[PDB]
């Protein structure tokens, strides 16, 4: 499986990992005027998951299953154990990690659900090297008190980074300078609006690239920039792929 | 249904960050459109519809001649019933589908009449349709995770290690597809004007093809008129040279990131 290990975790290897993850998720994608790939849809369950391995500093590895339709995690495996989100596709357990002791986590793979269960928000959850490593560990041993924040960390450092070059870049900075950070409005506004941007971009085909609704994306100075068309570089050179939304 | 928006009102900004404006808010058929400082006035509000019309004050933006050089105006939409309309490219070119002329601010000053001209991919033919018309301040990251920096008293540009808040590493992305020195917005990143050199440099903004850059989804900084992209000379950041090259998959020098 595509993988990343803490024993070789540099800006270059992280970048390559993210690049490859995007490539894999975009196999068979569709394209519109914007030229931003649109993830597959109506994918048969036997093919709906992309597995990626992450190894911590202890040579302990977890395998995460990513739904290729939405670039979200559905479950993961650690040794002979597996854990599925409540909202994982109902038939997933028959397709992935079948030869393990399967468990269902009492929460959904969404930030909202994870933050409620863990009692901690993304704004208050540090990201960086230490956190990536620790998150893999917490998931490997399934320490319940740290599972929710571990997903907040990994979802953002892996999946949201795949979705947005801006987020990938934040993580790169964190690795290069070994400086941890918490996401600010700029990063959170992207995560929040991925599906909405996907819908507007696709819908804009009928309106000369203009959106039906404006989306507020914040900059690093905490200023909101209204993105009401495809003509903003902060969108078109940033969002790497989209969720399928329109015929 | 959300996949089929029926309309959207927005502004249109371009050269030097000015807005497309129906001069004096006049409504007579043939009333000309110009560039003027952006504001909230109705004569700067353009409504887009699925019929390929772009309207202000209830009338339609349109060219006024088949040949180049005539004004763009607003006119009764009923006169365009049997017309294909406008098509906007992913890079911000606004083109009359039938004639192929494109919206242009052609004069030596942007305080000018807009006309329908032959497309040459000039910055003066690049537009940002959208309500947020301001330049976008950003850093531009390239090879070796370095940042483009304005050097030699704002005459050259090359990569240097990123330093937060280092003034010369900030760029202002304008509505006309120019990349401007953040603290001297009269200066633009420009492809070479000397055929003997492929070196990208910084020059006074002039609306030219040399100064129009498109940040593509594939990660390149493209000069559409010249069918080329920004590249790190020999894939070596230490050469302190950024050049215009045909797009190629060899090396990573043609990949960039916008970090705002
Ligand atoms: C696009 O350009 C075409 C061609 O110049 C314009 O079509 C002319 O429209 C006027 C009014 O409809 C008529 O007098 C002419 O007979 C048309 N000429 C031709 C050659 O077709 C059209 O109006 C333009 N549309 C826009 C939106 O700019
Ligand atoms: C913008 O459009 C108008 C209306 O079509 C033109 O008359 C303007 O031409 C200018 O004014 C005329 C009277 C003449 O002096 C001509 O040489 C000028 O260029 C045109 N230009 C401007 C700047 O208003
Ligand atoms: C989780 O997801 C499902 C939607 O797929 C929803 O019905 C449910 O309300 C959510 N549950 C929690 C625990 O929030």
The answer to the question of whether B153 is labelled as a binding residue is: no
Q: Which residues pair with B222 in a beta bridge?
A: B214, B229
Atom of ligand 1 nearest to the CA of B116: 28
CA-based angle B175:B177:B183, to the nearest 5?
A: 75
Domains and CATH numbers, chain B: 1-134 (2.80.10.50), 135-260 (2.80.10.50)
> Does residue B79 have its Cβ closer than 6 Å to ligand 1?
yes
- Give the C-alpha separation, B60 to B83, whole Å: 12
Alpha helices in chain A (DSSP H): 11-25, 111-118, 129-141, 147-154, 161-163, 165-176, 185-203, 233-236
Is beta strand B70-75 parallel, antiparallel or unpaired with respect to B31-36? antiparallel
Q: Provide DSSP, A66-135.
A: EETTTTEEEEEEETTEEEE-TTS-TTGGGTSSTTSEEEE-SS-SSHHHHHHHHT--GGGS-BSHHHHHHH
> Does residue B245 have its Cβ closer than 6 Å to ligand 2?
no
- Within 13 Å of residue A37, how many CA atoms lie on the same side as its CB? 22
Q: Which residues of B touch A (CB under 8 A)?
A: 2-5, 7-8, 10, 48-50, 52, 54, 86-88, 90, 92, 127-132, 136-138, 141, 145, 162, 173, 215-219, 257-260
Minimum-distance CB partner of A234 among B8, B49, B136? B136
Tell how far the Cα of A67 is from the centroid of ligand 3, in angstroms: 17
Q: From B116, B14, B98, select the one nearest B61 (Cα to Cα).
A: B116
DSSP class of residue A166 equals H
The answer to the question of whether B154 is labelled as a binding residue is: no
Minimum-distance CB partner of A212 among B5, B136, B259? B5
> Does residue B86 have its Cβ closer than 6 Å to ligand 1?
yes
Tell if the CB–CB gap between A237 and B257 is shorter than 8 Å: yes
Chain B nearest-CA distance from A206, in A, is 6
> Does residue B71 have its Cβ closer than 6 Å to ligand 2?
yes
The answer to the question of whether B40 is labelled as a binding residue is: no
For chain A, the distance separating the N- and C-terminal CA atoms, rounded to the nearest angstrom, is: 32
- Give the C-alpha separation, A188 to A216, whole Å: 11
Per the CB < 8 A criterion, the answer to whether A2 and A17 are in contact is yes
Tell if the CB–CB gap between B49 and A207 is shorter than 8 Å: yes
Q: From A208, A226, A204, select the one nearest A217 (Cα to Cα).
A: A226
Q: Which residues pair with B72 in a beta bridge?
A: B63
Q: Taking CB atoms and an 8 Å cutoff, what residues of chain B touch A208?
A: 48, 52, 54, 86-88, 129
Annotated catalytic residue within A115, A133, A160, A168: A160
Atom of ligand 1 nearest to the CA of B72: 28
> Using only C-alpha atoms, what is the Rg of chain A?
18
CA-based angle B157:B177:B233, to the nearest 5?
A: 30
Is beta strand A49-55 parallel, antiparallel or unpaired with respect to A2-5? parallel
Q: From A15, A29, A27, select the one nearest A242 (Cα to Cα).
A: A29
Which listed ligand is nearest to B65 at the C-alpha?
1
Which listed ligand is nearest to B113 at the C-alpha?
2
The answer to the question of whether B43 is labelled as a binding residue is: yes
* Residue A160 annotated as catalytic: yes
Per the CB < 8 A criterion, the answer to whether B5 and B197 are in contact is no
Per the CB < 8 A criterion, the answer to whether B23 and B37 are in contact is no
DSSP class of residue A181 equals B
DSSP class of residue B113 equals B
Tell if the CB–CB gap between B8 and A207 is shorter than 8 Å: yes
List the resolution, Å: 1.7
A198: nearest CA in chain B?
B3
Tell how far the Cα of A222 is from the centroid of ligand 1, in angstroms: 45
CA-based angle A180:A181:A185, to the nearest 5?
A: 170
Tokens, residue B200: 């990208």
Minimum-distance CB partner of A36 among B128, B137, B217? B217
- Give the C-alpha separation, A66 to A51, whole Å: 6
Whole-Å CA distances, A105 to A83, A87, A206, B4: 6, 9, 42, 38
Domains and CATH numbers, chain A: 1-163 (3.40.420.10), 164-247 (4.10.470.10)
Tell how far the Cα of B11 is from the centroid of ligand 3, in angstroms: 40
DSSP class of residue A65 equals E
> Across the A/B interface, how many CB contacts are shorter than 8 Å?
119
A201: nearest CA in chain B?
B3
């Amino acid at each position: 499986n595509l993988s990343l290990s803490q024993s070789n975790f540099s800006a270059d290897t992280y970048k390559s990992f993210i690049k490859n993850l995007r490539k894999q998720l975009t196999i068979g994608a569709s394209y519109g005027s914007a030229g931003i790939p649109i993830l597959k849809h109506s994918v048969p369950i036997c093919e709906r998951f992309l597995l990626v391995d992450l190894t911590n500093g202890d040579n302990e590895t977890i395998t995460l299953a990513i739904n290729v339709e939405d670039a979200g995690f559905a479950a993961y495996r650690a040794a002979d154990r597996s854990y599925f989100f409540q909202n994982a596709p109902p038939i997933a357990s028959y397709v992935i990690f079948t030869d393990t002791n399967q468990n269902i986590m009492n929460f959904n793979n969404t930030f909202e659900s994870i933050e409620i269960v863990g009692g901690t928000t993304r704004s208050e959850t540090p990201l960086g090297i230490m956190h990536f490593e620790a998150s893999i560990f917490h998931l490997f041993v399934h320490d319940e008190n740290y599972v929710p924040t571990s997903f907040l960390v990994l979802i953002q450092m892996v999946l949201e980074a795949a979705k947005f070059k801006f987020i990938e870049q934040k993580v790169i900075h964190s690795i290069m300078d070994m400086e941890d950070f918490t996401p600010g409005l700029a990063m959170l506004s992207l995560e929040e609006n991925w599906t909405q941007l996907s819908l507007q971009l696709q819908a804009s085909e009928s309106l000369n690239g203009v959106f039906g609704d404006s989306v507020s994306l914040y900059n690093s100075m905490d200023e909101p920039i209204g993105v009401d068309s495809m003509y903003y570089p902060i969108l078109t050179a940033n969002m790497a792929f989209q969720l399928y939304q329109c015929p | 249904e959300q996949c089929s928006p029926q309309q959207r009102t927005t502004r249109i900004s371009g050269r030097d960050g000015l807005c497309v404006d129906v001069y004096g808010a006049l409504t007579a058929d043939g009333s000309r459109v110009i560039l003027y400082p952006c504001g909230q006035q109705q004569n700067q509000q353009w409504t887009f519809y699925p019929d390929n019309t772009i309207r202000s004050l209830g009338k339609c933006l349109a060219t006024s001649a088949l040949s180049s050089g005539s004004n763009v105006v607003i006119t009764n939409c009923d006169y365009l019933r049997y017309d294909d309309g406008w098509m906007v490219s992913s890079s911000g070119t606004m083109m009359n589908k039938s004639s192929h002329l494109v919206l242009t601010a052609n004069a030596a000053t942007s305080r000018t009449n807009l006309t329908g001209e032959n497309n040459v991919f000039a910055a003066k033919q690049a537009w940002r349709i959208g309500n947020y018309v301001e330049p976008i301040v950003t850093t531009i990251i390239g090879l070796r995770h370095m940042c483009l920096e304005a050097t030699d008293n704002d005459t050259n540009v090359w990569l240097e290690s990123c330093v937060k808040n280092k003034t010369k590493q900030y760029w202002a992305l304008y509505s006309d597809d120019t990349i401007r020195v953040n603290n001297n917005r009269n200066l633009c990143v420009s492809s070479s004007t000397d055929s003997s050199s492929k070196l990208i440099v910084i020059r006074r903004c002039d609306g030219s093809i040399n100064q129009r850059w498109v940040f593509t989804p594939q990660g390149t900084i493209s000069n559409p008129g010249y069918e080329a992209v920004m590249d790190v000379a020999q894939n070596d950041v230490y050469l302190k040279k950024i050049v215009l090259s045909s797009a190629t998959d060899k090396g990573n020098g043609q990949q960039w990131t916008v970090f705002y």
